[PDB]
Amino acid sequence: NKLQSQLLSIEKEVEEYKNFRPDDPARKTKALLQMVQQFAVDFEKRIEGS
Amino acid sequence: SELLANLYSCGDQNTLMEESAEQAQRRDEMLRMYHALKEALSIIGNINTT
Numbered sequence: 001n002k003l004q005s006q007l008l009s010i011e012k013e014v015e016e017y018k019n020f021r022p023d024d025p026a027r028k029t030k031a032l033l034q035m036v037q038q039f040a041v042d043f044e045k046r047i048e049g050s
Numbered sequence: 051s052e053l054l055a056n057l058y059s060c061g062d063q064n065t066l067m068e069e070s071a072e073q074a075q076r077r078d079e080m081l082r083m084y085h086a087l088k089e090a091l092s093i094i095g096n097i098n099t100t
């Protein structure tokens with residue numbers, strides 16, 4: 001059960017890490033859209049209180 | 051978190067986001083109206099300037 005829990009915790013991320021290729025525009029653009037959405041949500045959170 | 055990765059997972063990526071014909075008609079209509087308005091303002095400029 002210990003090992004099963006550890007695998008469950010790690011799997012969601014190593015699922016992406018195992019497919020890494022440095023020359024991957026798709027990853028770069030997905031990261032760009034994730035960073036921009038995070039920034040716009042944090043900003044609205046601090047200003048509007050939403 | 052997953053939608054853009056799925057969209058990049060589609061079978062044919064060279065035909066994704068191909069514009070319809072209506073967008074192609076609207077592009078030409080908007081440019082035609084743009085040049086028409088510019089020429090009208092140039093002429094009003096010539097009339098007032100004399």
